[PDB]
């Protein structure tokens, strides 16, 4: 099955052509001479030369200049060069993502690669370093041309889908930059049945270029992308990532469980493969110190942040806007406050080699949450705009409840029940009121103990219900939610709603031709920044 082809002309006449057909099974078939074979009823026996190195489908094949070399690139992130005068083969093996497109310069010198993680690098030959690098937003895209290795019915057929919203924070102390979670490539992210986004990139908003990139969860770019069976490996996804008040800390959570096909031997009684994969989870909670050059450094990693007989899922974390403090809500029930102390065992401090002391984060406070079990609970938390009170929605189905907890003391200041119809999706705290969404969307003032605005959203599928989310502005008191318009596919529309804090009328109603995957709030000014599926970014501002 033909994935691509490149033709070179053998020449001011046209004497012959040489066709290189890169097929979807992995091979590259070189048909050497065609016009002298089909110029002449009867033809002689034509037989292509087979060059098989790629496991998956070969994405791009091109002849190189003089015609000595056949350069190529596939899913395996390796630019390969067939020597073609000898039998040999030489390759530039470990790029960031899949080699989705190559071109050769008008002269023989430069190659230009379109890498699958929204990038282009003009390489020079035999220096083999990118003399020109251009990066984009790299988020999850519903692709127009679907995939080049979704043609031949693999073990996991690659589907154009968005399962979860993009994890992104605009960073204070530098509001032009945007930290957001990405994988190695788009196809390598969505492959495997789960989002595998073990990296973040910092992306400039004011001039739309990807500034830098770094690993958060464990990644192996220099290892093989595919298992021996043929399934692409999944890497730990950074689910919750939120940024501190100062501009100097960053806390992320990354989860990984083994795939369902892999267990097969841990099943004993009523244990299914999903139950075994859920038992064998790995949920790390890592604290990053952000340097001045947007370089993240680890300070602590907590292997089991919420633990009982087995490890517990962490549903949300939030940063206190008045101190350096991260609250995390878990599946055990408890809300934990983490704070930075200095490393000091017996008065003898441990310092970095330049001299500054080593900070380390640890659980300052534990707050057990009250449960109210009428006859799979999820959580959400947010601080105030002032600090000093943390609102914690705890989330069994229909009966769920928010608890307002003091920060200085661990006592419960308030509890409010009966405000959730289904499972809680998110909760933010504007200046006095909690804006929370489940199947309903409710603005609920706690200084008056009174719900102002209540909406019953339209019933949709579970993927769209997962992909609805909101964000508050905290400078001009306005919040903004995002919901695709009713399994997900390519052509879907989404509409975002700009509300003020006080009224019930939506202050801006705009639908978009593609589904928006993230809304974020610029911390310095009013307004928002939205990121679309067909991955373009645009800003909304009042005035």
């Amino acid at each position: 099955i033909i994935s691509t082809f490149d033709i070179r002309p053998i020449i001011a006449e046209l004497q012959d052509i040489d066709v290189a057909v890169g097929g979807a099974r992995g091979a590259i078939y070189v048909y050497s001479n065609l016009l002298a074979h089909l110029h002449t009823l009867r033809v002689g026996t034509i037989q292509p030369r087979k060059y098989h190195w790629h496991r998956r489908a070969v994405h791009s094949v091109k002849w190189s200049g003089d015609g000595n070399y056949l350069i190529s690139g596939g899913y395996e992130t390796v630019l390969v060069l067939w020597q073609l005068d000898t039998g040999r083969v030489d390759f530039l093996p470990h790029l960031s993502a899949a080699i989705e497109n190559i071109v050769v310069s008008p002269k023989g010198s430069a190659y230009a690669l379109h890498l699958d993680d929204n990038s282009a690098m003009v390489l020079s030959t035999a220096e083999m370093k990118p003399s020109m690098y251009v990066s984009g937003i790299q988020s999850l895209v519903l692709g127009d041309r679907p995939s080049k290795d979704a043609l031949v019915r693999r073990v996991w057929r690659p589907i154009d889908e968005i399962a979860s919203p993009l994890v992104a924070t605009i960073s204070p102390q530098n509001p032009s930059h945007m930290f957001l979670c990405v994988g190695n490539g788009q196809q390598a992210t969505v492959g495997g049945g789960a989002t595998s986004t073990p990296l973040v990139q910092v992306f400039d908003i004011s001039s739309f270029q990807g500034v830098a990139k770094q690993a958060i969860a464990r990644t192996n770019p220099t290892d093989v992308n595919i298992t021996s069976e043929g399934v692409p490996i999944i890497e730990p996804t950074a689910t919750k990532l939120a940024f501190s008040h100062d501009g100097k800390w960053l806390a992320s959570i990354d989860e990984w469980q083994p795939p369902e096909r892999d267990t097969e031997a841990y099943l004993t009684g009523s244990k299914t493969q999903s139950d075994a994969c859920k038992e064998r989870r790995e949920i790390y909670l890592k604290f990053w110190e952000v340097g001045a050059d947007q370089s993240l450094e680890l300070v602590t990693r907590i292997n089991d942040a919420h633990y009982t007989k087995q490890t517990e899922s962490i549903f949300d974390l939030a940063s206190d806007p008045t101190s350096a403090r991260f609250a995390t809500i878990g599946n055990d029930g408890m809300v934990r406050f983490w704070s930075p102390k200095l490393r000091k065992r017996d008065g003898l401090m441990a310092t970095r080699p330049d001299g500054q002391p080593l900070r380390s984060w640890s659980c300052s406070r534990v707050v057990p949450l009250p449960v109210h079990e009428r006859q799979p609970y999820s959580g959400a938390i947010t601080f105030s705009e002032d600090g000093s009170i943390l609102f914690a929605a705890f989330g069994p189905p229909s009966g769920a409840l928010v608890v307002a907890i003091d920060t200085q003391t661990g006592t419960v200041r308030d509890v409010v029940s009966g405000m959730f119809k289904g499972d809680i999706r998110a909760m933010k705290s504007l200046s006095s009121c909690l804006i929370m969404l489940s199947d309903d969307l409710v603005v609920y003032d706690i200084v008056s103990d009174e719900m102002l605005a209540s909406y019953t959203l339209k019933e949709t599928s579970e993927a769209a219900k997962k992909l609805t989310q909101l964000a508050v502005n905290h400078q001009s008191r306005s919040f903004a939610l995002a919901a695709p318009i009713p399994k997900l596919k390519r052509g879907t529309k989404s509409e975002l709603l700009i509300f003020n804090i006080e009224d019930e009328e939506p202050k801006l109603v705009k639908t978009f031709s593609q589904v928006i995957i993230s809304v974020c709030a610029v911390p310095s000014s009013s307004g928002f920044v939205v990121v679309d599926s067909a991955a373009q970014v645009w800003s909304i501002t009042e005035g």
């Binding site: 992995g26 019915r153 043929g230 009684g269 449960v371 509890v415 029940s417």
Partner: protein, 359 residues
């Protein structure tokens, strides 16, 4: 649409100053959607709104401000009250929203209201069917549940409607976290009332059959452990605790025995199921390796049928050729087997009979 509810609340205020309870009750029936007949489901109630709930609790219940108040029945005989009980609107957040004025100076408000309210429902009905309905209907904190267990043990410790709620409140107070249960139990219980409760939980343990043998749980162990830590040494500091730990060691040995038998019996059942599948296919004639005799084999391994699909490079899936299926079957034979061909096979109808040497 706040002004419409404000006018309706002022009209109900006019009905209160007229002291005509009947049209007020009919207006609450119309809002909640006298005769007052019920639907027979605690779940299947129609959705009502928060301001009418707040007005209902504000008109029914009462507060005494002397630096600490007391909820009281302004309407002790009301279908509105039993509807609030059955529809579960009697939560502490609801009553605080109803009484934001008088309680904003009051401290320890959750403890006071959680102590006072089930006492009030119990003095309303001596049969406490309304208390058991409240236990089954409302979101309940640990103070409310320990006061409700105090009420049911006051009643006991026609004759099953109390023990049903006694079973309900154990499940709820086992669902609650340890801290609130311990602090509310230490507050509202006396160290001999806890001994009464620990005899009730021993009645739920021994009569259930744990100490009893065969030839002649997680929600009660939490309650026992939380009561024991809530009393502590300040309550007790006899042979009662030695026989107590004897029966708990007996129940623990029973649970560990159940673990061992669970593992062994589940593995033997799964092997028997898959071996039944393989023996049915071998009786069809697909000629797999099955064990003959009646003891279990060493490796509990059955040969599955060969799948119709093959995983090619790099990961793709193609159809198995019958040629390759025949190759794998030729591997699956042993070193000696008797393969009887029948005259029905030579006619083309049936299949063979294979008896192979046991490897």
């Amino acid at each position: 649409s706040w002004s419409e509810w404000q006018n309706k609340a002022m009209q109900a205020d006019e009905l209160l100053q007229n002291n005509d309870i009947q049209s007020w009750e009919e207006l609450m029936a119309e809002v909640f959607k006298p005769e007052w007949e019920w639907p027979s489901s605690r779940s299947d109630y129609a959705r009502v709104d928060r301001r009418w709930v707040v007005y209902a609790i504000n008109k029914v219940f009462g507060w005494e401000g002397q630096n600490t108040g007391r909820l009281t029945c302004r309407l002790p005989e009301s279908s509105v009250l039993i509807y609030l009980v059955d529809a579960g609107h009697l939560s502490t957040s609801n009553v605080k929203s109803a009484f934001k004025d008088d309680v904003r100076e009051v401290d320890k408000v959750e403890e006071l209201i959680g102590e006072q309210l089930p006492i009030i429902l119990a003095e309303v009905d001596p049969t406490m069917e309304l208390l058991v309905g409240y236990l089954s209907g409302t979101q309940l904190g640990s103070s409310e549940l320990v006061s409700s267990i105090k009420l049911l043990l006051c009643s006991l410790g026609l004759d099953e409607h109390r023990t049903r709620g006694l079973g309900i409140a154990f499940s709820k107070l086992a669902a609650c976290p340890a801290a609130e249960t311990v602090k509310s139990l230490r507050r509202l219980f006396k160290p001999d009332e806890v001994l009464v409760l620990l005899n009730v939980l021993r009645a739920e343990l021994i009569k259930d059959g744990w100490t009893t043998r065969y030839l002649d749980i997680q929600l009660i162990a939490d309650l026992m452990s939380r009561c024991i830590d809530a009393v502590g040494l300040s309550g007790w500091m006899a042979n009662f605790f030695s026989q107590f730990q004897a029966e708990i060691s007996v129940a623990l040995e029973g649970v560990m025995e159940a673990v061992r038998l669970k593992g062994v019996i589940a593995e033997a059942a799964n092997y028997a199921k898959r071996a039944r599948r393989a023996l049915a296919d071998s009786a069809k004639g697909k000629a797999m390796t099955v064990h003959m005799s009646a003891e279990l084999p060493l490796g509990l391994k059955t040969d599955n049928k060969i799948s119709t699909e093959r995983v090619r490079s790099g990961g793709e899936i193609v159809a198995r050729s019958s040629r390759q299926i025949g190759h794998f079957i030729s591997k699956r034979r042993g070193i000696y087997s008797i393969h009887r061909i029948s005259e029905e096979m030579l006619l083309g109808a049936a299949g063979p009979t294979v008896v192979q040497e046991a490897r």
